[PDB]
Every structure is written in C-alpha cells, then in structure tokens.
Amino acid sequence: VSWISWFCGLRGNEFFCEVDEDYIQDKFNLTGLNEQVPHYRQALDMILDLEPDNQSDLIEQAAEMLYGLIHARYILTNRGIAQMLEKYQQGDFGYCPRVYCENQPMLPIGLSDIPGEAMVKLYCPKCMDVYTPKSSRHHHTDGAYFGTGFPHMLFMVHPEYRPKRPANQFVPRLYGFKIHP
C-alpha cells in the first residue's frame, strides 16, 4: 500500500483522487508549497513512503496538508481531471440537493485557494451554485485541497459533460394559484 492509497481510502476522503507521483517527482509542480507547510521535506518523503525522519504525529498532518495542496494542482492537469471525471461519473461527490436539478451529480470545489479558510463545498454544473456536503465526514476538508477553478477546468476540457439546463423550475402556489413573488 502507498501512503497515498491509504490516505485516499480513509473515511472522509472520498473526494480525493490518487495523485500520480510522477507529477510529484517534478519539482516544478511543488513551487511555493515548501514555504507553506511545516516540515516540508519530512512530509514530502512520508507521502512518497520514503525514509522517515518523538511524536511523529504532527508530520502525518503536514503530509496531509502537503498532499492536499498538491492535489489541488494535480486535478488541473488532464490526468487529474480524468481521474476526477471518473469519480464524477461514479457520483463520488454526491448530487445537487436542489429539487429541480434532478440529482445532477456535483463536483468538489474550494471557495478559496488559500489553506484554512473554508471547507470544501459542492458545485453543481446544472445549478452553477455551490452547496455544503450533507455528510459531516467532509466538514473537515480544506477547500484549498481542491481549489476554485477545478470544476470549471474539467468542463472546459469535457464540454460534452456539461448538463442541459433545468426543464423545470419551482413555482410557488397557494391553492393552485401561481403566487408572485
């Protein structure tokens, strides 16, 4: 088992995909992450199952953070997008709660690209609005681990997947009478 497969397999991390480590091997992708997560190299090795080095517990955390931040970049590359598109087709991220979006499958998104500013939310292509995950096992995931441009990039590479707009809409009525507004 890889550190990564283990992570992505944990409960609450259903929204993540396994980042190809080739991507991680290209130092050019990790630009500026070093000046962002504590124990950078120590955490980077841990993610790569490389040599460790006394509560080396706080490391796993920075490994999460690091992994998380890398993920946000990865899913902008075609492979990442492909892996995510697959989880999309599997409904891994849930479906739009809005009644008239008829369970349109959602995509994970971040309200900010800066860490620790907001927990990952859910985007609906149909709606084009963002919602809060119904599960709580997802109320501790940083939106920054997904970013703000991911959902868009995906659809701006796979347009055939964009949904047809809602054939129906909510129409308020008191007794069969359309109330306005």
Site of interaction with a second copy (CB under 8 A)? 97-100, 111, 113, 121, 128-132, 134, 148-149, 152-153, 170, 172-176, 179, 181
126 binds, among Zn ion, a second copy, none (CB under 5 to 8 A by kind): Zn ion
Annotated binding residue 101: yes
Three-state SS across 131-171? ECCCCCCCCCCEHHHCCCCHHHHHHCCCHHHCCCCCCCCCC
Q: Residue 168 and residue 147: Cα distance in Å, rounded?
A: 31
Question: Which DSSP letter does residue 179 get?
Answer: -
Residue 89 Cβ vs a second copy, minimum distance, rounded to whole Å:
21
Q: Which amino acid does the sequence have at 45?
A: D
Distance in Å, CB of 128 to Zn ion, minimum: 8
Task: Give the torsion sign (CA, 97, 155, 33, 16).
Answer: positive
> Which one of a second copy, Zn ion, none interacts with residue 124, CB within 5 to 8 A by kind?
Zn ion
Q: Which of 68, 143 has the CB closer to a second copy? A: 143
Task: Give me the least distance between CB of 23 and Zn ion, in Å please.
Answer: 31
Q: What residue ranges bind Zn ion (CB under 5 A)?
A: 96, 98, 101, 104, 124, 126-127
124 is in an annotated binding site: yes
Q: How far is the CB of 125 from Zn ion (least distance, A)?
A: 8
Q: Judged by CB, which is closer to a second copy: 1, or 171?
A: 171
For 41, what's the count of Cα atoms within 13 Å in the CB-facing half-sphere? Answer: 2
DSSP for 18-43?
A: ---HHHHH-GGGSTTTTTTSTTHHHH
